[PDB]
Amino acid sequence: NDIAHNLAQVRDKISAAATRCGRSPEEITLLAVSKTKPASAIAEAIDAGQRQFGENYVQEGVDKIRHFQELGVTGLEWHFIGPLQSNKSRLVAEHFDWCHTIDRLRIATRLNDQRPAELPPLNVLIQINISDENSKSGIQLAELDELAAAVAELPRLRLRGLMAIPAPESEYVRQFEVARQMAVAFAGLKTRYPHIDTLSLGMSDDMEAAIAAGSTMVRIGTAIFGAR
Ligand code: PXP
Numbered sequence: 415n416d417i418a419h420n421l422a423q424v425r426d427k428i429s430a431a432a433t434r435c436g437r438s439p440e441e442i443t444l445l446a447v448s449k450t451k452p453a454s455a456i457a458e459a460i461d462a463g464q465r466q467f468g469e470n471y472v473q474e475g476v477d478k479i480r481h482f483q484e485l486g487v488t489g490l491e492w493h494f495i496g497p498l499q500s501n502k503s504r505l506v507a508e509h510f511d512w513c514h515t516i517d518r519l520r521i522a523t524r525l526n527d528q529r530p531a532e533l534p535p536l537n538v539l540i541q542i543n544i545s546d547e548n549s550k551s552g553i554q555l556a557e558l559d560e561l562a563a564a565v566a567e568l569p570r571l572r573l574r575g576l577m578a579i580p581a582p583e584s585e586y587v588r589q590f591e592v593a594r595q596m597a598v599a600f601a602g603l604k605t606r607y608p609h610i611d612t613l614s615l616g617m618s619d620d621m622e623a624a625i626a627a628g629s630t631m632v633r634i635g636t637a638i639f640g641a642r
Pocket residue numbers: 447470495496579617618619633634635636637
């Protein structure tokens with residue numbers, strides 16, 4: 415693999431997908447999903463221009479984070495995008511800049527209470543289980559309003575929007591409709607809540623549908639770093 419080459423290609427596809435549907439490419443944030451890839455591979459991405467990285471497992475994330483802190487690398491943004499058990503919340507709160515997987519209030523409160531006061535608030539997204547009946551992550555859409563309100567008062571967090579890991583679909587129509595469900599909910603949150611600007615939605619194979627539907631952040635793993 416040439417990570418630098420993949421980055422530019424993915425970025426071209428992102429830019430193509432945004433322009434094709436009348437969006438500025440500036441609206442879509444590329445989040446490089448570096449789970450199960452060595453810090454050397456992240457380094458190749460960092461050198462090529464990538465600054466935003468997503469990790470699914472806490473210790474693996476912190477190692478990579480501590481590592482690039484020691485090298486002195488600036489302007490990085492680390493998103494934790496895997497499920498978050500209670501006993502591993504302290505590590506996420508101390509080292510990450512974003513968490514995409516808030517799906518119950520006890521975990522949000524722990525993250526709030528373990529977040530060092532010198533750090534800016536942890537940017538958090540509420541995860542919706544929009545279409546996956548084999549998953550236990552994410553709330554139902556009916557729960558969004560209540561959970562968003564509870565989480566919105568936590569002063570060491572900053573509620574920024576919604577995330578969803580849709581059940582896998584092959585039909586492009588279903589990818590788009592499911593993503594549109596999320597964008598509608600995102601839209602509705604934004605009419606009421608301050609600084610709702612992030613809809614984390616779309617991976618390597620449903621990128622186009624997700625961007626057409628209104629996603630602001632795609633989470634690309636395979637098309638950048640190869641397979642896992
Ligand atoms: C939460 C999350 N986002 C993004 C990805 C990236 O998927 P892909 O490799 O197809 O780009 C993954 C892979 O597990 C993921 O779990």
